[PDB]
Structure 1
Amino acid sequence: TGGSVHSSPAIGQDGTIYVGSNDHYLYAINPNGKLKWKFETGGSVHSSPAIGQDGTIYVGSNDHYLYAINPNGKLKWKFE
């Protein structure tokens, strides 16, 4: 990615790999290694994502928000 990947990846039920980066994005990567989408947060993503039963991706950011991202990469909500 654009920067160091400190976040630990989480795997969705279809095999999608989600991981944060110090370049401030949450990445969703297809199992073939091609980008599915990237979601820009405010700061570095030092949280490792967690996946909900309905596929929602949750990750903390250094901008003080907990993000909930839909599986298509659009923001579901952010909590401060």
Structure 2
Amino acid sequence: NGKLKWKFETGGSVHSSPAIGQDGTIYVGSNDHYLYAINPNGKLKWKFETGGSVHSSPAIGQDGTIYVGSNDHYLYAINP
């Protein structure tokens, strides 16, 4: 009904648009260079560091793989 359930702070702007895994993990990039994987309760599952801002929005493969781009020129494939 438009109340905060929770808010996770990253180190920079979040322009990336979140994706949701089969188990409800939320994946989103940040200008702080990381891809984040966050649990449905608001805690960090893991974060993967790229060489640049992650403005790209993650996609999730059939086998759980997370793809997303970065400012650092690469497209990343990361295991869930």
Q: How big is the shift at 1:17?
A: 0.1
Q: In structure 2, how many angstroms separate the alpha carbons of the residues matched to 1:20 and 1:46?
A: 6
Report the TM-score, using the length of structure 2 for normalisation.
0.88
Residue 14 of structure 1 aligns with which residue?
23
Q: In structure 1, how many angstroms separate the alpha carbons of the residues matched to 2:55 and 2:16?
A: 5
Does residue 1:5 correspond to 2:19, yes or no?
no
Q: In structure 2, how many angstroms separate the alpha carbons of the residues matched to 1:26 and 1:50?
A: 12
User: What are structure 1's unaligned runs of at least 5 residues?
Assistant: 72-80
Report the TM-score, using the length of structure 1 for normalisation.
0.88
Q: How big is the shift at 1:34?
A: 0.4
- Number of aligned residue pairs: 71
Q: How big is the shift at 1:12?
A: 0.2
Q: How big is the shift at 1:23?
A: 0.1
- Structure 1's consecutive aligned runs of 4 or more residues displaced over 6 angstroms after TM superposition are none
Max Rg structure: 2
User: What are structure 2's unaligned runs of at least 5 residues?
Assistant: 1-9
Q: Report the RMSD for the aligned CA atoms in angstroms.
A: 0.3
Q: In structure 2, how many angstroms separate the alpha carbons of the residues matched to 1:32 and 1:65?
A: 30
